[PDB]
């Protein structure tokens, strides 16, 4: 399966044990009406592009 790019469209809150991962909605670059919730390790603001090694995995909402 290929490696799909995705756009940080809203940064939701903060997840993890030590508040070590921001939770985020990512607008896909191919299908511009597919927006999934994904956990991100490290600093992220609105509109930065994440590379996903798979798009089938999906984070549980905090």
């Amino acid at each position: 399966q290929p490696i799909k790019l995705a756009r940080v469209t809203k940064v939701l809150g903060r997840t993890g044990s030590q508040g070590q991962c921001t939770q985020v909605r990512v607008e896909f670059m191919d299908d511009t009406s597919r927006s999934i919730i994904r956990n991100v390790k490290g600093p992220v603001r609105e509109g930065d592009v994440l590379t996903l090694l798979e798009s089938e995995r999906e984070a549980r909402r905090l």
Binding site: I3, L5, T15, G16, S17, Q18, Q20, C21, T22, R38, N39, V40, K41, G42, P43, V44, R45, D48, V49, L50, T51, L52, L53, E54, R57, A59
Partner: protein
Amino acid sequence: DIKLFGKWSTDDVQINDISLQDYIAVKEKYAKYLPHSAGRYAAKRFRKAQCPIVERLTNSMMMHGRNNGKKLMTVRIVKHAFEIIHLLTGENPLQVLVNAIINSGPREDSTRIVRRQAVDVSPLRRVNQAIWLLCTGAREAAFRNIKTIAECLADELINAAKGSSNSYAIKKKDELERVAKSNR
């Protein structure tokens, strides 16, 4: 006008991975002569991003105690590293750098949320780690060795710009991504 060490131009290089377009600062407004600036980059949260990656590399180099503060030691190492990358590759070494930041960044990393669930890295987290991995790639190669950091940092930036796997930074990166693949 003409740029970096008086001899490495800016409008030759292209950032391939659009993921790191804004987080690899090397282009037009981030064209400085030396990788040395007062900056005050590390004051508010993301301003770190608007630091030229050459200056981030320079800063990331001066590590393991004794070297902390010796930025001119590193400015020099980077200058002689780029000479070696040019004469071993025949290329504006800022492209070899940018290719190494693109290749040598991990794209998915494990985290403790049991055993360590896999999450995605921030692009800035990728640039941060990229530069860390290929700086530790240099200093660990160079430690207790006849070779200089000029050679070791160059060899690291070259092997990373290829993805050779002889690169410490590529080998640790695809190890992290292997452990991230595991817990998925």
